[PDB]
Design a protein around this ligand. Structure first.
Ligand SMILES: CC[N+](CC)(CC)Cc1ccccc1
Ligand SMILES: [Mg+2]
Ligand SMILES: [Mg+2]
Ligand SMILES: [Mg+2]
Length: 340
């Protein structure tokens, strides 16, 4: 039962949930990886990792992925949540130096992950392990594109560090541009490709229908996160959330901002429904009779199907994951799964 302010009847009726058959093994394997890479204290792994639903989130998204690809994506994604927690704690504790050094190491490790597999900072070592495995699936050009996108993500996290230490809430348009990077829209879009076994040519993945469908799936994910994570974020003095930009810069009340964010999320859905028709027509056109055409057609179709699956996976994740259950915490400003 989804809270009325967060309920999206269109998702519930028209975006049926999917689950990858590897999910049971994925759940345990990622938990063991968090333990073995020392990315969370052992007691917090035992108590909270399964309830955080990070593997469920990816298993409801990259359907069809080879099991090894899904494992790498799930480990990376769990790493990414831990990194968001580290960034938050560095801000709260004023650790500008520790953050700057981590930022620098992530840039270096992203270009040379093998050199960082045993780094003294386990967060860097964990990042490097997941990235080295993601780099083993597709040609170096895909790896270069993932790296180019994630260098930009790291710098967006640095900008968030600047904003929060200075108490600056970005304007709405500034926020929307920044959120495409902090939510890592283009990373999740990149990762559709190893999940369907094909690096797409630029001419295919830049087709306007593929680009627009990919954008809308990610805007929904990020803004629905903003809608559902607003209570934890207000309680933790987070400033990055579309609702906060609207309350601060447009003088909306909390109820008005929640309504405006919900309307924007709803529009992502119906805009996606329109463009999905064009993206699937494009998939059909690629099947021109040749072997290569069949390959590209099947890959685009699988990727657009996963852009759809992201809507339902993100929707239910926010109601299942312990990450957002601020009402259950003794200290609303300090989530119990974070290392404080
Ligand atoms: C890895 C999770 N993420 C995305 C970058 C950072 C903490 C937040 C998020 C969760 C779920 C949906 C959209 C964004
Ligand atoms: Mg966060
Ligand atoms: Mg964040
Ligand atoms: Mg959030």
């Amino acid at each position: 039962a989804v809270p009325p302010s967060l309920r999206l009847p269109v998702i519930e009726a028209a975006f049926p949930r999917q689950l990858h058959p590897y999910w049971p093994k994925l759940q345990e394997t990622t938990r063991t990886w968090l333990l073995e890479k020392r990315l969370m204290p052992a007691d917090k792994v035992e108590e909270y990792a399964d309830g955080l639903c990070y593997t469920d989130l990816m298993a409801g998204y990259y359907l069809g992925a080879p099991d090894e690809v899904l494992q790498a994506i799930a480990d990376y994604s769990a790493w990414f949540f831990v990194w968001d927690d580290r960034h938050d704690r560095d801000i709260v504790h004023g650790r500008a130096g520790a953050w700057r050094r981590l930022r620098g190491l992530l840039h270096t490790a992203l270009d040379s992950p093998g050199d960082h597999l045993h780094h003294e900072d386990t967060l860097v070592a964990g990042f490097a392990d997941s990235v080295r495995r993601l780099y083993a699936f597709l040609p170096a050009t895909w790896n270069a594109r993932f790296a180019r996108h994630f260098h930009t993500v790291i710098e967006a996290y640095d900008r968030e560090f600047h904003n929060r230490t200075r108490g600056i809430v970005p304007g709405v348009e500034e926020y929307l541009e920044l959120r495409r990077l902090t939510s890592a829209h283009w990373i999740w879009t990149d990762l559709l490709e190893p999940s369907s076994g094909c690096e797409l040519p630029d001419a295919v993945r830049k087709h306007p229908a593929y680009r627009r469908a990919a954008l809308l799936s990610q805007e929904f994910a990020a803004w629905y996160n903003d809608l559902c994570s607003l209570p934890k974020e207000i309680a933790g003095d987070e400033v990055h959330n579309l609702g906060i930009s609207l309350i601060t810069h447009h003088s909306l009340t909390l109820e008005e901002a929640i309504g405006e964010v919900r309307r924007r999320v709803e529009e992502c859905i119906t805009e996606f429904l329109a463009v999905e028709r064009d993206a699937l027509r494009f998939a059909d056109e690629l099947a021109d009779g040749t072997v290569r055409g069949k390959e590209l057609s099947g890959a685009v179709r699988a990727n657009v199907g996963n852009m759809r699956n992201w809507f339902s996976s993100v929707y239910w994740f926010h109601h299942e994951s312990g990450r957002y259950m601020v009402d259950s915490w003794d200290d609303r400003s300090t989530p119990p799964y974070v290392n404080n």
